[PDB]
């Protein structure tokens, strides 16, 4: 890192901010057919 975590984390921030992909707090697509069709 340079001084704090963000300077360093600026690259992994992605790893985490993008990590929300699996969580998917929301999903316009649909939420009733995710096991068959």
Rounded Cα distance between 36 and 16, Å, is 30
Experimental method: NMR
Dihedral sign, CA of 24, 26, 31, 33? Answer: negative
The secondary structure of residue 21, as a DSSP letter, is H
- Any idea of the CA torsion for 24, 28, 29, 30, to the nearest 10 degrees? 90
Half-sphere exposure of 17 (CA within 13 A, CB side): 7
Rounded Cα distance between 34 and 24, Å, is 13
- Any idea of the CA torsion for 29, 30, 34, 36, to the nearest 10 degrees? -100
């Amino acid at each position: 890192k340079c001084n704090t975590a963000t300077c360093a984390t600026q690259r992994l921030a992605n790893f985490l901010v993008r990590s929300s992909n699996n969580l998917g707090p929301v999903l316009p697509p649909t939420n009733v057919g995710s096991n068959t069709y």
